[PDB]
Write a protein that binds this ligand. Structure first.
Ligand code: A1IEF
Length: 120
């Protein structure tokens, strides 16, 4: 396995630029990887987005030399992407256990929430 929970990656989703995220356990399935291999990630930004991504569409954040990193220009997506970058940079400066406690999304009822530390 190339990744574990808490690892910072860039993931490519169709219709989006390469986005900063953190490998995490799917809070419904209780698993972070499965079978080609997939990994569950949460996307840094202003909304609690998550997804199962194939390993070919993931690379470490901070194989990595072969991808083309392109930043969004469109205002709305760019500001969300910049928020994700600021958060992934702060997470990169912390230990794996500190970033799991600070950035892991929380289910409150059936509603997926940003980690209250991030929300505040
Ligand atoms: C490639 C990462 N992103 C951008 C993003 C991430 C985290 N926060 C903001 C934007 C994703 C990924 C996925 C699977 N879905 C989405 N979304 C669907 C609805 C619009 C957008 C963002 N959500 C929102 N309420 O504004 N975005």
């Amino acid at each position: 396995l190339k990744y574990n929970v808490g690892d910072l990656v860039w993931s490519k989703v169709s219709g989006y630029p390469w986005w900063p995220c953190m490998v995490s356990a799917d809070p419904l399935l209780h698993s972070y990887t499965k079978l080609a291999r997939q990994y569950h990630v949460q996307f840094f930004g202003d909304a609690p987005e998550r997804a199962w991504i194939f390993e070919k569409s993931l690379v470490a954040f901070a194989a990595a030399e072969k991808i083309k990193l392109l930043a969004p220009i469109s205002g709305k997506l760019r500001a969300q992407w910049e928020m994700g970058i600021v958060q992934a940079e702060e997470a990169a400066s912390m230990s794996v256990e500190e970033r799991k406690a600070k950035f892991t999304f929380l289910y409150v009822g059936a509603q997926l929430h940003l980690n209250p530390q991030v929300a505040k």
